[PDB]
Design a binder for this molecule. Structure first.
Ligand code: HEM
Ligand SMILES: CCc1cccc(OP(=O)(O)O)c1
Ligand SMILES: CCc1cccc(OP(=O)(O)O)c1
Length: 405
């Protein structure tokens, strides 16, 4: 009953609280986290657009202050990473991003769609063959696929899938979790390991070359592009976290939300050409990220409310995606929604998601082939899906399902 019901870290059903915030206090200061909480769509899209007033430099600063022990651990481990791009500000961001998109060329996207599809069918069949005819859409399908894709694109061993998810859970907990000074210690070590592997791969590209993003970036350095080895390594640190966890969550939510609405799963079975629009509606209705942070570089206003220089802003895009002023019946999941692409789950402006297409790519491929091979798929029960507490990432821990077999 406090802060209009908003619980910053509970990710199981924040949408009722989002709804009353939009009506009662659209720009609310939450002392429990230190942020101005913004919930209406215009307000949020405007804040994204004016990057010159609202810096993103705190997007990767931890919500809870790093404790003495994690600070010593990461310092003694040589951890010098902050942010590949998402918390970089111009001129550094502009300069580094343009070099990144000259290696993130969308031909690589569409060139190896077939090996994505061949890998889904592999995973779908192994799920359909086991003692119990019950599966988990996260571990059985959505855990591997985007991870292997991003490891193949950058040049990591695809045998290290469990190391990179262990490093992802750490980064997602260290930075947006409600961690104590003890609880940072195990993730502190993981981030040190993760940063040292990012640096090990960059030195590898100098020495032995390759055929991949890591090689291409160093290859652009050798050809005169203004990007250092600390920035090459920071670009891997960004892509080897953001490049799969959000996409794992999107795939898991595709089956979570479509199986909660069997009528639209049934329409997806009828017509697999509706699948792309379904993904657009899942992204609006259940985004992987519900909140993203910014920092006021000067005294300003959001929606009439005065905000001091240096104040932190939390843009609740999960709330914006249901604003009745932009989405009629915003709280209903409807894959036929005409303007679902107006959603802000990939952001807006100079930090827009670099791999939005690569994520939607694998989301559509997973629906296309799971609806075909397993058209009778459905949830086990109604109350069997929990979400890890976080400020930004709303990750379902499991999507338990069964089928006709
Ligand atoms: C699967 C669903 C995904 C969602 C919902 C998502 C969401 C976001 C959001 C909210 C931002 C910040 C936008 C802003 O501040 O303006 C962002 C930026 C970014 N995303 Fe994604 N993302 C997803 C997948 C991916 C994938 C697959 C990749 C790479 C393969 C990726 C890489 C990045 C990078 C590098 C940035 C920072 C770009 C910059 O700061 O210029 N993300 N994403
Ligand atoms: C416990 C309910 C309550 C009572 C008084 C103030 C208040 O304000 P808030 O906690 O800052 O939202 C809440
Ligand atoms: C999903 C957007 C995102 C999230 C976390 C890190 C990141 O990359 P980085 O901040 O540049 O290291 C991107």
């Amino acid at each position: 009953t406090s802060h209009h019901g908003y619980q910053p870290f509970d990710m199981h059903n924040p949408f009722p609280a989002y709804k009353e915030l939009r009506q009662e206090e659209p720009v609310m200061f939450d002392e429990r986290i230190g942020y101005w909480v913004v919930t209406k769509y215009d307000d949020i899209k405007t804040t994204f657009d004016d990057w010159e007033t609202f810096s993103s430099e705190n997007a990767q600063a931890p919500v809870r202050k790093r404790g003495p022990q994690a600070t010593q651990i990461m310092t003694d481990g040589g951890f010098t990473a902050y942010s590949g791009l998402s918390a970089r500000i111009p001129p550094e961001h502009t300069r580094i991003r343009a070099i990144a998109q000259k290696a993130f060329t969308p031909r690589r996207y569409k060139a190896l769609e077939p090996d994505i599809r061949a890998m889904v069918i592999d995973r779908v069949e192994k799920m359909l063959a086991n003692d119990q005819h019950v599966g988990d859409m996260v571990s059985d399908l959505a855990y591997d696929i985007p991870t292997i894709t991003i490891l193949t694109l950058i040049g990591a061993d695809i045998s290290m899938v469990d190391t990179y998810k262990r490093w992802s859970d750490s980064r997602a907990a260290m930075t947006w979790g409600d961690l104590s000074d003890e609880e940072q210690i195990p993730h502190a070590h993981n981030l040190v390991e993760y940063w040292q592997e990012c640096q090990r791969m960059v030195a590898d590209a100098h020495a032995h070359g390759g055929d991949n993003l890591t090689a291409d970036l160093v290859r652009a350095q050798q050809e005169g592009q203004e990007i250092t080895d600390h920035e090459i390594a920071s670009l891997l640190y960004s892509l080897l976290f953001a490049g799969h966890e959000t996409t794992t969550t999107l795939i898991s939510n595709c089956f979570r939300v479509l199986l909660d609405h069997p009528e639209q799963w049934q329409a997806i079975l009828e017509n697999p050409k509706l699948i792309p629009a379904a993904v657009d509606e899942v992204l609006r209705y259940s985004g992987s990220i519900v909140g993203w942070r910014r920092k006021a570089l000067k005294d300003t206003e959001i929606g009439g409310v005065a905000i001091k220089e240096g104040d932190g802003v939390l843009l609740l895009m999960g709330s914006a995606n249901r604003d009745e002023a932009r989405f009629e019946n915003g709280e209903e999941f409807d894959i036929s929604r005409a303007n679902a692409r107006e959603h802000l789950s990939f952001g807006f402006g100079i930090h827009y998601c670099l791999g939005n297409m690569l994520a939607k790519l694998q989301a559509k491929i997973c629906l296309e082939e799971v609806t075909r091979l397993v058209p009778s798929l459905h949830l086990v029960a109604d109350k069997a899906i929990g979400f890890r507490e976080n400020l930004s990432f709303r990750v379902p821990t499991s999507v338990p399902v069964t089928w006709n077999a």
